Symmetry: C5
Subunit: 263 residues, 5 copies
């Protein structure tokens, strides 16, 4: 896109607020919303078939911007974003394996293990690279993936591309952001592994991310659409009988946009 001047005047700036609820695998408006189902493990790579509801998927939404029509596009210049409900992890009473399980004593162990925190702000869908731990994993039909993807899918294969077009069906473990594309998206990711890792979460309303590139240009919203994506896996919930499910948290978006003149 050929980028001309920032068009100033009244109603040249707009703010949107939005939230993505996590898609950890268990369904909406049932007792385990925000959790996955209990994780099963295969005996080998050949027979690996992870059941639906046992693994997280990316959350995404298209935010409709004020109607506009050289033309004007909305340009996203800055954002605030927050993981919400971090306060809930101070819960060590709700059906958790205890610190001293043998002695039937102590607090629950809380949420612990893997953390995966990622968000993207763009003017088109987030662009994805298929990459999996085990290529022979058979994903369920509810999921969007590349079927029979081959051994090369265990690392970077330039043919195995996609775009984040549906909320709660692109498995986190089978798709990542594509650094060969996403010129019109900003993406940010942090992974900390383990199964006994303590989660580390910060929250403040005073931190701003600038979305402008090296040329001072932000994501440009094609079709007057602003695209938000995340995954916010906090760790595992561990029950008394040692069963383990993913726990995730919702994510808050504030985005500021100004009118940009473009060819």
């Amino acid at each position: 896109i050929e980028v001309l001047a920032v068009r100033t005047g009244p109603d040249s700036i707009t703010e949107i607020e939005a939230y993505l609820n996590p898609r950890m695998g268990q369904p909406q408006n049932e007792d385990f919303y925000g959790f996955s189902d209990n994780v099963t493990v295969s005996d080998d790579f050949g027979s690996d078939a992870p059941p639906w509801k046992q693994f997280p998927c990316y959350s995404t939404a298209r935010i409709s911007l004020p109607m506009l029509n050289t033309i004007l596009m909305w340009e996203a210049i800055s954002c605030r974003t927050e993981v919400m409900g971090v306060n809930m992890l101070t819960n060590v009473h709700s059906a958790q394996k205890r610190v001293y399980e043998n002695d039937r004593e102590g607090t629950g162990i809380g949420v612990e293990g893997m953390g995966y925190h990622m968000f993207a702000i763009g003017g088109e869908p987030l662009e994805l690279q298929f990459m999996v731990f085990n290529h022979r994993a058979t994903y369920p039909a509810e999921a969007t993936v590349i079927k029979n993807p081959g051994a090369s899918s265990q690392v970077f294969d330039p043919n195995l591309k996609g775009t984040l077009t549906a909320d709660g069906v692109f498995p986190v473990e089978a798709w990542g952001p594509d650094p060969f594309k996403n010129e019109n998206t900003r993406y940010f990711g942090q992974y900390t592994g383990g199964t006994q890792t303590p989660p580390v979460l910060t929250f403040t309303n005073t931190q701003t991310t600038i979305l402008l590139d090296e040329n001072g240009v932000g994501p440009l919203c094609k079709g007057d659409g602003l695209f938000l994506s995340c995954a916010d896996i906090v760790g595992f919930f561990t029950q008394h009988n040692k069963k383990m499910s993913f726990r995730g948290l919702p994510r808050y978006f504030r985005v500021t946009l100004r009118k940009r003149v473009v060819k």
Copy 2:
């Protein structure tokens, strides 16, 4: 929000207040375990989960009265900067008071001390902290003494836009049930750190040399409605483990130093 005009300069245009918030870990004031929760019990499942009063921490808050003031134009107090410290970090050097020993089998070694989660949040606002209700388990039956949303529904396990409140009382809002609402709180600044686990090493810092600016992007700080400065916090430091392995929350008090100035407004 409020239409903000010029900063008023002149004699006694600046004020400084100091305050503290004692923690509300669960056990009463004036009794032997003030600073602690009662011993934490754990339900078998989500469906019969009733955390009794005193076994969980609540938020601390206080309204500080500012000097009285007063047209198309009134003055308000504008919080421009602050200092805050967790106080009593020093007491965690205690490894002799009735603790699980690091070699309990052998009855030897120091106490294990306070270990486990840290939840450290504070808020400085010109009105009560606006809260988002969110719980690990929506079927948790909270006790009569706590302020919660009743029958929250399954969507309270994540974000649900209907489930709001305001931190209007000390020692009664369960930390596990309420968080700062990022869709509101334009007139409050809040800051928060969580580190999880149960045997996690606690890490506290303290110094009288650190200032946090409260001014937003347009250099407007929180403006104190009705001449009130609203201070909120929670300062879970970790868990205390008795000899017989029962575990309780331990908290510490927070100090606040807030510098305010007169601002002209509609």
Copy 3:
């Protein structure tokens, strides 16, 4: 103190160097200097009486600065003002010792290195023109501290959190328990303090040392600590961790602290 003009030039700046040895509890000029006695633990909060030598105390010293004033009746006087400092934990090298009478990594097999010094880190220093102002605060109020220690007696349940009546000044070396006193943020206008706690009984000590790092001691107005009666007050506590013997007994280990303070002459009322 009405603060006026700084003095400039070559004669206007002085450096003092000092050290504080740790007060971990075992007496100086004995085999266990640097250490506490082996820690014992109470059965409950009520019968808690931590014996002398089994817990650390603050280190403190008043340094006497050049007396600047020939006459102290004049309308103004020179005061020393601390503008910058360097501080190092000394003896970090010693913690590479994994041979000296330490529970071994595989003690069941009587094999492997000593586990070395692990556990609680507590490192704070204060530089001020007057004693460090303290807030009394204890884990358990019913702990009866030994006669050798300076504490608030029968402090009450409120002393387990913030009580505004329970105040103090660090007025002596090796007697104010770390576990009962911390710096009071409601005071210390004339003092700068910094601390960090890292707990957890298996936690590895993390220590850095360099002669290249300065800490500026000027406040928001450009004013350093003003040394009242020509006194520079240095305070610290450096609990490195715990020494674990073969019989699983455990004592605090401390390290000494180096201080370099740069002072200039400040005119005052």
Copy 4:
């Protein structure tokens, strides 16, 4: 050393290249365990130590051909591609959220819990230069007999367990210089920038970040980037994420591919 003169400015004075290096963790490409090493085996003593090919990881490298700039290579001065900045990301971090693919479970005794996922050492290094990455030979155990497929210094002295000034190399091929045997040589590499992090442990959880907003400047203290000789940009990296642990407790290295974006400008020289 090259005698460097003025920088060219304006639209045509800039070029950008995107590239990737896939890991060389030991197992062959186009087979079921590409991205992994073979199950690791451990020797009884230093003397008999002989790591089977596929069981240890090797460096990745590629030469990027840049547009040829000079019509007459006999000129007083000529143009050179000068690398001024890069972005690099580890790709496929996402896949580490897999705890169902045949991993030792956290409660193995009870056939319960998730997998333990990838755990343990991280070795993350990247290098960018106008000529191949220059290497120092240094090994844990000098008596290690490396297989024919690998490039090593043979019968290295006991001196090769520390710094020996004679034991030099160049990263001249992909997937054959073993990470455990070669490292960047700080006595050389004037024309390359390299960056590396080692995090040990066997239960150490991996910590990776990914963003398209992070730029590394490659200019030196005099404002000079790597100058690309024969119009070649050399990219080198190792990205050992940690170990995969099967049910039967056998462990292999898991690797991830690296993305490179390099911004270059025209520099006058000679």
Copy 5:
């Protein structure tokens, strides 16, 4: 000390040296365990504590001869440096004869090097000035080591009498000697320590990091007798055999110093 006047800015006014220090973990040069200590034994008590020679590491040091050089003399002033720990790559070895993760099932990778980091380096115009300090003042150090004999109880903390200078390579025990902060006016020094026996080692390497050696008066270490003085200790962690015997492993350090001609006195 030295009264320093101006910087002679001319041609061949700036020089550069590169050097390495190999580590002195205890095992001799030109034998199979170069880079390691011998297997560490532990005393039963403080009063019967004698670390056998080779079981503990010593400081590395060397003097670099600089190009050779009245009411004012010229001196070499060190202005900037680079240092890297080398051979971090070797720590990806988990196959060389070490305790396995699952020793009871004879399975898994070697546990690799774990435990304590002690990384320091000093750059100066004279030998590094040392403070004696020991965990146990009653430890009996072998004849090969340079220590203060019968140091007394105050050597367990700071005693202003217990001074030394790092005058030799591989004989000053790390656990006995530290950089003296009451001296080293003409030396810059830098240390980090992480303790423990199972600690995950953390090492970074790059050739893009410069340290500025100048003081608050923009004066660098001045090289007396045209000698540049390098010192370090680089303990990475502990190597564990199948039989649970442990030894220190160290790594060599790279130095690059830029010096300029200073007029003095």
